[PDB]
């Protein structure tokens, strides 16, 4: 019984600082980059990543928000079964730990139509065996919505943080995962219907050979996680040739450098 | 001295500062006395007696002063006490000085007297003073006296034209102040840094005098920097032997012998001690000390102490109470108010008369603060720093006025305010110290200059100070206001700081020299003078009396910290002092050696925001820095409340700095007193301290780091972060409008794209629309484009287009805008390159074109990127996308000539016994190349392609191809083009001894002349020229029929056509190809080069069979070249030379120890300096490699004939130097030393590459950029320098190799590694330089059309490179389509400017036509610019002094060389110069032109490099003027025109047109001029009249002088003319005049113009000139040249019947007086 006693105040800890602090290092993961590289479908597309733009995209990224972006690539001349990606891009977006949330509206851009879509790279925590089925969704609804996605040529690159490191695994859907995709509405992580024969892994390597590059929005940055209001399932963007800037940069949350000031 | 010892400095520092009292006994005058009181005890002082005026003490009255200085002194009669005293060593000497007197007892007025004598030295006759030749600097130790200085000075010298002004804190603008600022009053830590930075063309030169004003600072912890000052002032008056004057001002107290001592002061001649005494006002002191130690009670015993006391002087004496904070003031104040109200005491100040008590409610009632309306209503005031500046006035003003009886202040207003009052007391002697992170006492300083504040000066008949403090420091407060407590130095404390700044100077090179400097050190006095307190035995300084063990001893303590910090590279066995960038930054930006090396450890390119403000707040400035108790509280809220998280607990000071840097910028004011000083100590330093992390991160090219530390700068700058409005940076707006445009989070970005009304509706608040429109576009913004030119597959050349795109405003913008352009990779993550740049006001509306190199490679990356950032502005930056995606690349380079393996090749080849003499007694063999393409050039008459590395003997092989054309055409002639007239010489010399002298042909150099050059042609078999003097010949080759007659045309050093003089050489080659194809008999054309990539290309354009193209790449040079290049990762340059120095000796020790060398150095200054430290490095040398290889006794004949001192002291110890000021037969006899084998050195300055007629086993390029002075920034060395250079490291016949090491920075290693190793590609620039080439062609009737101008485009080298490499010439594809459109817009481009300008004329669009102009800009080969210019600046009132200006104007006179000073000071004789300008302008090449001429024109005969500059003049004055005249001829005026004629007259001898013509005779003087004028008449013609004798007679002259006067009379023009008219009465109006006149000439020519003012020998040219004189029309012109007798006709159209005469004018170009004017009648 020690009320008035012993009396102790309580000191704010507001969550985001510890989370600032911690993705300040991640850096450090670029230099254990790990391909799952499992011995499955030796005869679909092989898919080259550059590794300028993966340390780049690891390095803007949170820890527990995930960040999406856009693959865009080619294939090398007279060798049509690889895919190199060729090019990352940043839209608008928020996250939560199991899902990205993205603008409907695919990029478009002169330096863009020369390239096909190859699908989307996302970052998660942690590394688990099976594709999401909020990826299975999110990739079959991007796919009813936008034909230029070919489901045998759009696949999903998982980046999960492995401690002190970063696993990649690349998934494809399958004709039973597109379908089930479409109509899914269960955001949940056990919903009905989903099933491991949805998605097939693909081939994929980590290159030095060449190196991709990064579209923009034009007229704001890619990280709504600090403004989640002001982003829109139906918000329209332009793009720009410039490099994304860092998950807690002063632009993605200028809330944190007025209020505390002007108050 | 091996045996020494690491020292613990901090055992040698005086802790406490300036509160440091070495003295143990304290003696008060008579008369002082103790009182006990409870709690605290009194001491009293009575007020001093004025000592009795004694012998000869007279006050000076001003009128007996010097007269220039009693302007100073206006409004004075007598002088002071102590300015008499003073007045003669002050005024009349230049000695040293040091002054010691009491506070106000008038020193500064002394600091009058000394500058005025300095200002007097500077006076003219006109009365002017040369404001623009001296300095002198005040030193002040407090900013607000440095602000009263200012203007104080500035008023009492204002009637001298003197600017007395203070430095802020920028750096750019601080040049500009410091160029037209006489007097620079500072303080000595801004003196330091400015002394540290150094550098190029700075001010600190014309410094004459230092004033160190209240000197005993020494004894401050800030001491250390004067004395820093001090040592560097003296040191560098040694090494320029140019005296600087230094003035010490002090308060009186012990060791005034021992600083008079460290100032070099005399102490018989300078030294003035004044005791108190001499105070202007006696001061009686009460010092009171407290014992009480409780705190509670000591507060209420000090504020019943101040009570007290001040009852004592209530209605009696005005007080002022001083207090150590801002708050204080007020709380104290209140505390006493109060404390008189609770007694009847309030009435006691304010009188029973209203006035004052009424003005005081008035002044509270309009409300001057809340304080104040507390306080002013009572008697009370208060004045600090954080009032208004009208308070704080009106707070002045109600003192003066004694409306206030009780004023509570800090030491601001004592310092930077005069504000006595009777009575003074200072509450309390401590203070908080940030720095120190605690409670301290008052410094020295602030204590003396309050209690000076005590005693109205003609108010009062005596003062009163009241000092209250603890009771331990009475005796201390006692020693200092009773002059004794002594001045020690604080050094030690400093000492590495400070050494490693003499260190990154370049004064300090290794320990002894630190010794030496140390000496000059305040403490060295002070530890010879009393050692025990400095820790030295008295055993220690008889074992050592100079104290050198132990400087020694101190300076490898200092060294070895410095050392370990990364500063600098301490080698301990030699003892040297390697500079380093982590040094020279610590120096620069002032910050302590501890902190850089935390930065160099902590810095890493992954850095955030987080880490980096956790970096800054480690620095060591921050070391005492603590986290109280009391603060955690205040703090807390704070730590979770700023944006940038921080890692480390808030119980860590660490913490706390970073919390109070983000608090600073989101601008929370806190509450704590600890907090805001230490929050206000922290900011202060946050500047430099991420200034200097900004230059560490931007230097090592880390882009990330980089914005954010930038960012951080200005954020910290602004105090906002960028996530506000940027428009929050305009101070004029309202913060109530910047509110609600940032309350809208819409993009600032959008409003460029908006009216003013859609702005004003935008922000909900349409009357502000037009406002915020405005300001949006005041913002600076600019715009970028980008033209990439690829030079190979690996690297890309970048011109970069800056289009400002903001409107200009000088209130916003200043003078200028400063910006970073950052070449960044494509995962902007290193930056490839980068550079400051400056938009001028001037340029403001100018697009700005920048070019640089960058690397790529192969797979191409997708992009790179170019930002552009303000330097100072936030969130203002422009990043351009440079994509490759369209980008073409050259294809690699074919592999080089295969080298064969041929036997040597034997002078028997030659099969020609007078051919073989010529190389018989030089060489058996030729060299492998000569060997390879002999039977091409000899046997063949193909057109061959040499291309080799230079010292290849390249040369040779167009002797070869020479020999063949005299075997073939007993009378061929071969023209040999060189790009430089150097090359040109020496080529002349060794081709007229081998072929001439030998082989008895004519070789010939072509001179410029026309005239003299067409019949050079006609004459020689070998003619020589540079590429313009071949141009303007072979223009007219239609009408010159010599220059199709060519045989052989060999072109040297062909790869020059990539460089800035490239285009003519082009020309001139594809103008031969051209004729060839014309000409029955082809003209055979052989080419040299060095090793090109490209060759194919050069020989496919110069048509050379793929057989007879050799390109050997460099590897194949006969003697082999060893190339080293060393990078210095220095990015600036005097540190970057310091640098280099020793590797420069050492290089000459391990490549050449024994064989010659030669150092290149950028400049004159540079050649000296580098032997002196080659020299001085030789000598503390070991095994030390002396450079004398001959005698000293067979040195004198050849050393005396030197006029320079430095230049023989160097020489003797085997080491000369060449630069272009010495004297001809200087540098030739340097030069036969050098080939003598006598010295083994030479250091030569780059601008001499090209005429250099030694060789050398190693070459040294010391470093690659130079300084030029008009676009004041520095420039790389072209590479053709690099490769000219590179080829001096080459002697055949006597080295098995050559050796070259280039010292570059290390963003430069790379570029020679690309562009030494492998051969050159060279591009054409002849679409930049089209237009004259151009209007000749169509003046020569070979471009008619505009078809016709792309046909010549299809000969150029320039049309064959572009579809080879379409990117660098601006193409986007190689198809013929491409071509014809790329073409036809060069081609229209061309002949559109050409048409503007009146050149040329455009008929249907399709023909062009020639017209005047163009005429006369083909036919004197002038500059289009040159010419149009002129049209549109001649009237026909213009005079000599106009023509003198419109033609220094010219094209032709921009690339005029660049050096000033003495152009400043030729510009005094503007007064006395028959020219009138009215403009003042400096650096500038068209003005050193028109100063230069004129200096001609008086025959100034002073300076030297100067006088090459007046002869590039000269040699084209003439055709300038020519073109002069017939452009007025063309305006049919005659005042300028025949003004134009007399001018050419006048700069070819060297006269204005009052001089008279006498002047013209050889060993004439003024005297002679005077004679001549007395005896006779003054013509040249009256001296030939003279009788043999009475000319002898009255010419007091040799023998040999009047030979010469006689050779220049035989050579004077003597003719008669005959004016005759045909048809003289039968013509008729608008008719046929035709006026024939003859010239008799009475002898026929002897030889050229006699002209020895002039360096291009003349001949004499005439115009005869029909011109009616009061109509100022011209009827008739004709040029003429005449031998004996010459018959000239003149047409004319008659104007109408009326019979009339017409004036005549007979003109030369050349020889002034010979000029006739008769007149002729005609009738109709
Ligand atoms: C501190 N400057 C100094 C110190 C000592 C001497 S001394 O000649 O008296 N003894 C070495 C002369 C000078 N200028
Ligand atoms: C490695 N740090 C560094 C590298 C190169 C240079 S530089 O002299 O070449 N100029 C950019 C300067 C520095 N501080």
Redesign the pocket.
């Known amino acids: 019984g020690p009320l008035g006693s012993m009396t102790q105040t309580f000191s704010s800890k507001t969550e985001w600082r510890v989370r600032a602090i911690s993705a300040a290092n991640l850096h450090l993961r670029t230099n254990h980059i790990y391909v799952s590289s499992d011995d499955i479908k030796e005869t679909g597309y092989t898919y080259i990543l550059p590794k300028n733009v993966l340390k780049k995209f690891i390095c803007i990224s949170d820890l527990r928000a995930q960040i999406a972006g856009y693959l865009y690539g080619v294939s090398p001349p007279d060798n049509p079964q690889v895919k190199e990606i060729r090019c990352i891009v940043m839209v608008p977006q928020w996250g939560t730990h199991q899902t990205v949330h993205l603008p409907g509206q695919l990029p478009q851009h002169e330096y863009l139509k020369e390239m096909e879509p190859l699908g989307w790279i996302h970052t998660q925590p942690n590394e688990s065996p099976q594709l999401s089925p909020q990826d299975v969704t999110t990739h079959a609804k991007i796919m009813a919505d936008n034909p230029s996605w070919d489901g045998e040529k759009t696949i999903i690159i998982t980046c999960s943080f492995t401690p002190g490191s970063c696993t990649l695994t690349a998934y494809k859907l399958t004709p039973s995962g597109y379908e089930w995709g479409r109509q899914n509405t269960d955001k949940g992580n056990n919903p009905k219907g989903y099933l491991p024969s949805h998605y097939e892994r693909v081939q994929m390597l980590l290159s030095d050979r060449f190196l991709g590059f990064f579209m923009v929005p034009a007229q704001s940055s890619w990280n709504y996680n600090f403004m989640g209001v002001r982003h829109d399932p139906n918000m329209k963007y332009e793009l720009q040739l410039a490099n994304p800037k860092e998950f807690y940069h002063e632009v993605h949350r200028p809330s944190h450098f007025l209020n505390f000031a002007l108050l | 001295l091996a045996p020494r010892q690491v020292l613990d400095l901090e055992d040698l520092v005086f802790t406490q500062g300036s509160h440091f009292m070495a003295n143990k006994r304290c003696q008060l005058p008579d008369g002082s006395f103790r009182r006990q009181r409870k709690g605290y005890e009194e001491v009293h002082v009575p007020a001093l007696k004025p000592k009795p005026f004694g012998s000869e003490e007279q006050l000076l009255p001003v009128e007996k002063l010097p007269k220039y200085a009693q302007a100073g002194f206006e409004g004075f009669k007598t002088l002071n006490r102590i300015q008499s005293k003073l007045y003669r060593a002050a005024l009349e000497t230049d000695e040293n000085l040091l002054l010691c007197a009491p506070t106000g007892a008038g020193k500064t007025n002394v600091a009058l007297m000394c500058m005025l004598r300095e200002i007097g030295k500077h006076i003219n006759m006109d009365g002017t003073i040369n404001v623009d030749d001296f300095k002198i600097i005040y030193i002040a130790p407090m900013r607000s006296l440095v602000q009263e200085m200012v203007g104080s000075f500035g008023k009492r010298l204002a009637t001298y034209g003197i600017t007395v002004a203070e430095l802020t804190g920028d750096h750019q603008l601080c040049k500009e102040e410091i160029s037209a600022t006489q007097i620079i009053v500072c303080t000595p830590e801004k003196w330091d840094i400015i002394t540290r930075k150094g550098g190029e063309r700075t001010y600190t030169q014309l410094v004459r005098l230092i004033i160190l004003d209240e000197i005993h600072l020494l004894h401050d912890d800030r001491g250390p920097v004067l004395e820093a000052l001090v040592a560097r002032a003296?040191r560098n008056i040694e090494m320029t032997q140019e005296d600087v004057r230094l003035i010490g001002l002090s308060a009186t107290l012990p060791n005034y012998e021992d600083v008079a001592?460290?100032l070099?002061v005399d102490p018989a001649k300078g030294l003035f001690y004044f005791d108190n005494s001499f105070r202007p006002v006696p001061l009686e002191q009460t010092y009171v000390g407290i014992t009480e130690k409780k705190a509670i009670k000591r507060f209420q015993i000090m504020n019943e102490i101040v009570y007290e006391k001040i009852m004592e002087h209530a209605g009696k004496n005005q007080v002022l109470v001083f207090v150590h904070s801002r708050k204080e003031t007020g709380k104290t104040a209140r505390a006493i108010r109060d404390m008189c109200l609770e007694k009847d005491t309030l009435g006691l100040f304010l009188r029973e008369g209203s006035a004052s008590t009424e003005v005081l409610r008035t002044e509270a009632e309009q409300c001057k603060n809340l304080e104040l309306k507390d306080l002013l209503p009572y008697g009370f005031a208060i004045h600090h720093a954080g009032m208004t500046r009208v308070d704080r006035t009106l707070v002045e003003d109600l003192f003066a006025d004694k409306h206030i009886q009780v004023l509570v202040s800090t030491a601001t207003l004592a310092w930077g305010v005069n504000l006595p009052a009777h009575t003074v007391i200072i509450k309390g002697t401590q203070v908080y110290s940030p720095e120190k992170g605690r409670w301290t006492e008052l410094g020295a300083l602030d204590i003396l200059q309050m209690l000076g504040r005590a005693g109205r000066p003609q108010y009062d008949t005596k003062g009163e100070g009241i000092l209250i403090t603890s009771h331990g420091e009475l005796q201390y407060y006692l020693s200092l206001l009773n002059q004794q407590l002594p001045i020690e130095s604080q050094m030690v404390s400093k000492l590495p700081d400070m050494l490693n700044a003499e260190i990154v100077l370049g004064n300090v090179q290794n320990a002894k020299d630190a010794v030496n400097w140390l000496?000059?050190?305040?403490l060295?006095?002070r530890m010879?003078r009393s050692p025990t307190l400095y820790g030295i035995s008295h055993d220690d300084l008889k074992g050592d009396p100079?104290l050198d063990q132990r400087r020694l001893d101190l300076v490898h303590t200092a060294a070895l910290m410095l050392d370990k910090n990364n500063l600098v590279k301490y080698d301990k066995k030699t003892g040297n002092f390697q500079v380093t960038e982590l040094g020279r930054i610590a120096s620069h930006y002032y910050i302590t050696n501890d902190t850089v090396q935390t930065y160099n450890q902590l810095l890493k390119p992954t850095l955030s925001e987080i880490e980096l403000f956790r970096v800054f707040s480690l620095s060591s400035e921050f070391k005492n820095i603590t986290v109280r108790e009391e603060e955690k509280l205040e703090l807390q809220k704070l730590l979770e409340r700023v944006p940038i998280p921080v890692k480390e607990s808030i119980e860590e000071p660490s913490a706390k700095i970073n919390v109070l840097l983000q608090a600073f910028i989101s601008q929370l004011k806190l509450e704590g007193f600890a907090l805001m000083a230490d929050m206000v100590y922290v900011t202060q330093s946050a500047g430099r301290l991420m200034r200097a992390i900004f230059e560490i991160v931007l230097n090592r090219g880390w882009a990330q780091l980089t914005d954010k530390t930038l960012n951080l700068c200005k954020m910290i700058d602004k105090r906002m972060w960028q996530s506000m409005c940027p428009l929050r940076q305009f101070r004029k707006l309202p913060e109530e409008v910047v509110k609600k445009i940032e309350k809208k989070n819409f993009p600032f970005e959008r409003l460029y794209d908006l009216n003013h009304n859609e702005i004003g509706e935008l922000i909900r608040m349409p009357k502000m629309g037009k406002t915020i429109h405005k300001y949006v576009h005041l913002f600076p913004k600019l715009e970028l484009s980008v033209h990439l030119q690829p030079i190979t597959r690996s690297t890309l050349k970048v011109e970069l287009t800056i289009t400002p795109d903001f409107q200009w405003d000088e209130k916003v913008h200043g003078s200028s805008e400063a910006f970073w352009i950052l070449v960044e990779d494509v995962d902007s993550e290193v930056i490839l390159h980068h550079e400051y740049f400056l938009l001028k006001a001037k340029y403001a509306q100018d697009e700005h074109l920048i070019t640089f190199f960058v690397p790529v490679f192969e797979p191409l990356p997708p992009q790179y990127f170019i930002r552009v950032v303000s330097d100072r502005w936030l969130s203002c930056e422009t990043q351009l996308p440079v994509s490759f995606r369209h980008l073409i690349l050259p294809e690699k380079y074919p592999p080089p000539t295969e080298l064969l393996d041929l036997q040597p090749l034997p002078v028997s080849a030659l099969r020609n016994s007078a051919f073989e003499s010529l190389y018989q007694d030089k060489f058996p063999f030729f060299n492998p190349i000569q060997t390879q393409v002999f039977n091409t050039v000899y046997n063949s008459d193909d057109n061959v392609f040499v291309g080799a590395p230079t010292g290849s003997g390249k040369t040779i092989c167009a002797e070869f191809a020479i020999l063949r054309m005299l075997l073939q055409s007993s009378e061929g002639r071969c023209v040999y083009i060189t790009p430089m007239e150097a090359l040109a010489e020496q080529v002349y010399m060794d081709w007229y001894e081998k072929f001439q002298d030998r082989l008895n042909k004519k070789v010939v150099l072509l001179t410029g002349e026309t005239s003299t050059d067409l019949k050079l042609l006609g004459k020689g078999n070998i003619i020589i020229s540079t590429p313009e003097k071949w141009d303007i010949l072979s223009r007219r080759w239609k009408q010159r029929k010599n220059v199709q007659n060519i045989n052989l045309f060999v072109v040297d050093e062909v790869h020059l056509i990539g460089g800035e003089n490239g285009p003519v050489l082009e020309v001139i080659c594809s103008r031969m190809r051209y004729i060839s194809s014309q000409i029955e008999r082809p003209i055979r054309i052989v080419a040299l080069s060095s090793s090109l990539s490209n060759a194919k290309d050069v020989a496919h354009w110069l048509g050379c069979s793929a057989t007879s193209t050799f390109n050997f790449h460099p590897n194949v040079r006969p003697v082999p070249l060893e190339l080293h290049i060393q990078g210095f990762n220095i990015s600036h340059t005097q540190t970057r030379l310091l640098s280099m120095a020793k590797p420069v000796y050492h290089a000459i020790t391990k490549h050449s120890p024994k064989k010659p060398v030669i150092v290149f150095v950028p400049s004159r200054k540079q050649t000296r300096l580098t032997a002196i430290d080659i020299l001085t490095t030789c000598a503390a040398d070991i095994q030390r490699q002396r450079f004398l290889h001959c005698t000293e006794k067979d040195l004198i004949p050849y050393l005396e004939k030197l006029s320079d001192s430095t230049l023989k002291e160097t020489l003797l110890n085997g080491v000369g130097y060449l630069h272009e000021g010495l004297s001809p037969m200087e540098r030739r006899l340097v030069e036969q030393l050098f080939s003598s084998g006598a010295i083994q050195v030479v250091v030569a300055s780059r601008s001499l590459c090209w005429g250099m007629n030694v060789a050398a086993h190693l070459v040294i390029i010391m470093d690659t950029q130079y300084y030029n002075g008009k676009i004041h920034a520095y420039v790389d060395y072209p590479i053709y320098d690099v490769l000219q250079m590179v080829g001096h490291a080459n002697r055949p016949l006597q080295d098995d190799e050559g050796r070259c090491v280039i010292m570059c920075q290390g963003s430069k290693k790379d570029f020679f590694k690309k562009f030494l190793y492998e051969p050159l590609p060279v591009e054409s620039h002849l679409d930049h330089c089209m237009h004259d080439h151009f209007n000749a062609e169509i003046v020569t009737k070979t471009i008619e059309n505009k078809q016709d101008a792309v046909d010549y485009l299809t000969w150029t080298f320039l049309y064959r490179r572009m579809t080879q490499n379409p990117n660098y010439y601006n193409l986007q594809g190689i198809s013929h389509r491409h071509l014809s459109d790329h073409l036809s817009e060069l081609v229209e481009q061309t002949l559109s400017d050409l048409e503007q300008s009146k050149c040329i004329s455009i008929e249907d669009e399709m023909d062009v036509a020639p017209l005047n102009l163009g005429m006369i800009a083909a036919y004197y080969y002038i500059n289009y610019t040159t010419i149009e210019l002129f049209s549109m600046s001649l009237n026909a009132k213009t005079k000599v002094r106009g023509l003198i200006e419109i033609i220094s104007n010219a094209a032709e006179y921009e690339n005029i060389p660049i050096r000033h000073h003495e152009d400043n000071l030729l510009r005094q004789l503007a007064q006395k110069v028959p020219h009138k300008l009215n403009n003042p302008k400096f650096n500038d090449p068209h003005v050193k032109t028109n100063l230069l001429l004129q200096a001609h024109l008086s025959r100034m005969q002073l300076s030297a490099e100067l006088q090459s500059d007046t002869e590039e003049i000269l040699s084209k004055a003439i055709r300038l003027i020519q073109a002069c005249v017939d452009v007025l001829s063309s305006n049919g005026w005659l005042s300028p025109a025949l003004a134009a004629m007399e001018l050419a007259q006048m700069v070819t001898q060297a006269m204005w047109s009052k001089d008279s013509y006498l002047k013209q005779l050889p060993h004439f003087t003024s005297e002679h001029i005077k004679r001549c004028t007395d005896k006779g008449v003054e013509s040249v013609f009256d001296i030939m009249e003279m009788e043999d004798e009475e000319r002898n007679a009255l010419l007091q002259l040799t023998d040999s002088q009047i030979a010469d006067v006689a050779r220049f009379c035989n050579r004077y023009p003597n003719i008669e003319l005959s004016y005759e008219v045909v048809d003289k009465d039968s013509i008729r109006s608008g008719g046929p005049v035709v006026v024939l006149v003859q010239l008799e000439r009475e002898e026929e020519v002897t030889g050229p113009v006699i002209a020895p003012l002039f360096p291009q020998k003349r001949e004499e040219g005439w115009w005869v000139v029909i011109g009616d004189a009061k109509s100022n029309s011209l009827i008739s012109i004709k040029r003429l040249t005449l031998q004996q007798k010459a018959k000239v006709k003149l047409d004319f159209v008659a104007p109408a019947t009326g019979a009339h005469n017409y004036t005549l004018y007979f003109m030369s170009d050349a020889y002034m007086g010979c000029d006739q004017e008769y007149k002729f009648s005609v009738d109709v």
Not at chain 2, 519 to 522: F, L, N, T, V, W
């Open positions: 003296i001592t460290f070099r000496g000059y050190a305040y060295y006095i010879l100079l």
